[PDB]
Amino acid sequence: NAGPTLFPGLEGYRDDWNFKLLDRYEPVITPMCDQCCYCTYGPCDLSGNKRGACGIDMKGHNGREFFLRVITGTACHAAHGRHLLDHLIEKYGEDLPLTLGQSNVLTPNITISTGLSPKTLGEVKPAMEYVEEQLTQLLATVHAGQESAEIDYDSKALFSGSLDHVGMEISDIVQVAAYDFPKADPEAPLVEIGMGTIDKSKPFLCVIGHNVAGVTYMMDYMEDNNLTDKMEIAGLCCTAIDLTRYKEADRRPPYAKVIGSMSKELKVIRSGMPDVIVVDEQCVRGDIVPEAQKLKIPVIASNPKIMYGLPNRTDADVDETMEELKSGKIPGCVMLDYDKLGELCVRLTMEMAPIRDAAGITALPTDEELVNMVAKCADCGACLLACPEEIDIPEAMGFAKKGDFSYFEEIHDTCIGCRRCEQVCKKEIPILNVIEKIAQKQIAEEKGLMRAGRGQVSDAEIRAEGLNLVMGTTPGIIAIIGCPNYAGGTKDVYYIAEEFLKRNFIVVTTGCGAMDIGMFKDADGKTLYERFPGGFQCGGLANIGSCVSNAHITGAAEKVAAIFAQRTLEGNLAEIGDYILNRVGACGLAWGAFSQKASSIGTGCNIFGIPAVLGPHSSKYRRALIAKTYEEDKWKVYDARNGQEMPIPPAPEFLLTTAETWQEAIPMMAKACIRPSDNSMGRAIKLTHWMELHKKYLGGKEPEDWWKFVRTEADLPLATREALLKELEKEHGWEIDWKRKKIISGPKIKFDVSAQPTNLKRLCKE
């Protein structure tokens, strides 16, 4: 019954699938550095594809470096999962059932890799152990003198990507079950988001991190003490999404808020609004303590992965530790006991509010201070050179010197609040505070709504959308996910989500992307979550959840194959990815990808035949997967009906690439959804959206290669079918029958309703 790969090892998918994917979507290596500094024989200059002292060449090393980022991302989601699993089993028992909503195929990723269909917390243990076991084998391959072939590091990376989604799945399903998160809910409640949503008069407990476990005790303590309306509790990064999913299965009104993405961490701290900061792990700034300290904000480290060299008070009495923190004797402490954490953070917050108000703190510079520091600028250009976004700060200073703050006001949203610029300013100008002071107006308006993390896509939704997706009449699944390291501001994901929602694609989002998507409103003052329904449906926008919830996106695609197509999941990744690559239109977008976790997630999507567009900074990961559209033999598959080779259109033309601007990204994503098995109506529809979006965002003319995706007159966009038939005859020489208006000759690929395109020979009838 099961596929050929149960609990596979590193080589499991190598020859059967990965190498096939890698032959078409070729690794494009762009070194981030020309050297390797892994061991003492080095560093080695690998410029020009030279080999290191150990023998590995530049391409091999960069494959190795990308592989390292992937497994580091894989380990993050896994470590997260292991901690939730152990804690949750210890608190609620091994027999606690996995209640994730209306679905019978509960853990697709887990089932695919292990053949197991866990129904309880304890039943998930074997999958978690498998992942941890594989990660050790994978980290060992990063050691000098291990793999040297770029292509084999890529196969190892793709494999790790499949593991990442297993670990992410484990992470989210156990917390969805134990913490009563929404259950595949199309009507998950709208949560308020943005630095402007905070009630400055109330004490403010700010949490930054990923593991929501400790925060649940904070919230339980607040509810027990009737503090939910007296103080504010809001988070940054994933913990913000998960904490606002807590006990929301019944759709009760959210009482907590969400500040924003990782980009808001230094910005919210500099604002001085937080009274207490509690950090957990992952995507947590490394300068939080000294920054918090400037504004008398105590810092509590609640996870061993980040202790900041702070004194440990895990076994100390709460009252005394609170006195040490409120008095400012210590800037913060480590508190690893959850029972003590809840009370400590909430109480310290209530008590810190008055203390900090009495301190007479002026977080940002006064009007006078601003004018003075701006006048100090020497136009030396250092800040611009050090800015990761290459923002022209010297120009903004120049204009601000003469009362034109429009430049600084526009900079605010593009700036990622990293303060590299401040460290290089010889006049010691706190550049970030200059931007934030000038942006006060805009910040007060930073108020949006984000629909809570909904969880999985239900089997019911898969049955409703399965056929449509496969024929192509539903143009595809658009997944907007990932980090906020955008190159042009945070409104990009909004415009993109909107364009696609209006054209009726299925849009799902997670993490920082889900957050920013809800930070803007239209002329009527409505958010996209308000304008479009939250179901997994055409024209629907669903915030799947935190970054670990990305596992439900590949999970949904996997369920299309398992439920609609009735393919076997158990130990059968290759068949499932192959099915998706050939018949399920979809495209991911990680417009501001920055983290190692983003590389693993994207790589996981890739091994399942799902392409992804990343923002320009992503070019720094070192390895893209792009196909040569001009090489005929790169576009042939088998027809499972007979084993004969058959040609396929060049779609998608990549699996992992970068786009420069959001305007470019849109048409690229639309085109990326075209699939070999689209039926005639589906293709016509996909070609309509793509050709239209290409004209709208790239100059007004049609895509030069639009004709490469036409098998018959029925594939042609209906409204302009006439003019198009003309172009095919006119600029391509195709023979047309103007009586019935159809194509006689020209297409190199024929339409065949019964064809079974596959990259796997073993699935063919020979």
Partner 1 sequence: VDTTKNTKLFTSYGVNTSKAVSPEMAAKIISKAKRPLLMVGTLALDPELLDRVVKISKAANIPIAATGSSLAVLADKDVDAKYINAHMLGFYLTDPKWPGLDGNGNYDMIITIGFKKFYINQVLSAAKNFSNLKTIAIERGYIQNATMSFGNLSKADHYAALDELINAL
Q: Which stretches of the chain bind ligand SF4, using CB under 6 A?
A: 33, 35-39, 41-44, 52-54, 56, 61, 144, 377-383, 386-389, 391, 393-394, 397, 415-421, 424-427, 429, 431-432
- Selected from 109, 197, 271, 282, the binder of its own copies by CB under 8 A is 282
Q: Residue 531 burial by CB count (10 A; 0-12/13-18/19+): exposed, middle or buried?
A: middle
Smallest separation (angstroms) from Fe ion to the CB of 224: 29
**Pick from its own copies, partner 1, Fe ion, none: which does 689 bind, CB < 5 to 8 A by kind?**
none
Count of residues touching partner 1 (by CB under 8 A): 54
CB closer to ligand SF4, 401 vs 447: 401
**Pick from its own copies, ligand SF4, Fe ion, none: which does 380 bind, CB < 5 to 8 A by kind?**
ligand SF4
β-pairing, 257-260 vs 276-279, is unpaired
Amino acid symbol at 156? K
**Pick from its own copies, partner 1, Fe ion, none: which does 624 bind, CB < 5 to 8 A by kind?**
partner 1
In contact, 250 and 185? CB cutoff 8 Å:
no
Smallest separation (angstroms) from its own copies to the CB of 309: 4
Helix (H, G, I), strand (E, B) or coil at 165: helix
CB closer to its own copies, 32 vs 744: 32
**Pick from ligand SF4, its own copies, Fe ion, none: which does 593 bind, CB < 5 to 8 A by kind?**
its own copies
Q: What DSSP string describes 651-720?
A: -SSEEEEE-SSHHHHHHHHHHHT--TT--HHHHHHHHHHHHHHHHHHTTSSPPTTGGGG-SSGGGS-STT
Smallest separation (angstroms) from its own copies to the CB of 15: 5
- Paired strand residues for 333: 300
- Selected from 547, 553, 612, 684, the binder of Fe ion by CB under 5 A is 547
- Selected from 208, 306, 352, 659, the binder of partner 1 by CB under 8 A is 659
Helix (H, G, I), strand (E, B) or coil at 249: coil
**Pick from partner 1, ligand SF4, Fe ion, none: which does 547 bind, CB < 5 to 8 A by kind?**
Fe ion
CB closer to its own copies, 2 vs 33: 33
Q: Which residues contact 509 (CB under 8 A, 6 or more apart)?
A: 479, 480, 481, 493, 497, 517, 541, 542, 543, 544
CB closer to its own copies, 210 vs 675: 210
CB closer to its own copies, 33 vs 719: 33
In contact, 271 and 295? CB cutoff 8 Å:
no
Smallest separation (angstroms) from partner 1 to the CB of 414: 11
- By CB under 8 A, the residues from 18 to 37 that bind partner 1 are 26, 28-35
- By CB under 8 A, the residues from 101 to 130 that bind its own copies are 129
- By CB under 8 A, the residues from 431 to 490 that bind partner 1 are 487-488
The residue count for the chain: 766
Smallest separation (angstroms) from its own copies to the CB of 83: 8
- By CB under 8 A, the residues from 386 to 405 that bind partner 1 are 386, 388-390, 392, 395
Read off the tokens for 741.
């208006």
d(CA 471, CA 463): 14
- Paired strand residues for 279: 208, 301
d(CA 453, CA 249): 10
d(CA 556, CA 374): 52
CA distances from 598 to 432, 443, 513, 522, 548 (A): 27, 28, 12, 30, 11
Smallest separation (angstroms) from ligand SF4 to the CB of 594: 7
- Selected from 232, 281, 413, 702, the binder of its own copies by CB under 8 A is 281
d(CA 648, CA 660): 28
Burial track 245-281 (b if 16+ CB lie within 10 A, e otherwise):
bbebbeeeebebbbbbbbbbbbbbbbbbbbbbbbbbb
In contact, 512 and 262? CB cutoff 8 Å:
yes
* 514 near Fe ion, judged by CB under 5 A: no
Near its own copies by CB under 8 A, which window of 70-78, 213-221, 672-680, 681-689? Answer: 70-78
End-to-end CA, the chain: 21
Smallest separation (angstroms) from ligand SF4 to the CB of 707: 43
Residues 594-623, mask of contacts with its own copies (x by CB under 8 A) = xxxx-------------------xx-xx--
- By CB under 5 A, the residues from 237 to 266 that bind Fe ion are 238
- By CB under 8 A, the residues from 26 to 55 that bind its own copies are 32-33, 35, 37-45, 50-55
d(CA 557, CA 565): 11
**Pick from its own copies, Fe ion, ligand SF4, none: which does 126 bind, CB < 5 to 8 A by kind?**
none
Q: Residue 406 burial by CB count (10 A; 0-12/13-18/19+): exposed, middle or buried?
A: exposed
Smallest separation (angstroms) from partner 1 to the CB of 372: 25
In contact, 248 and 545? CB cutoff 8 Å:
no
Q: Site residues (CB under 8 A) for partner 1?
A: 26, 28-35, 42-49, 58-59, 381, 385-386, 388-390, 392, 395, 487-488, 616-617, 619-620, 624, 626, 628, 630, 653-654, 657-661, 663-664, 668, 697-701, 703-704
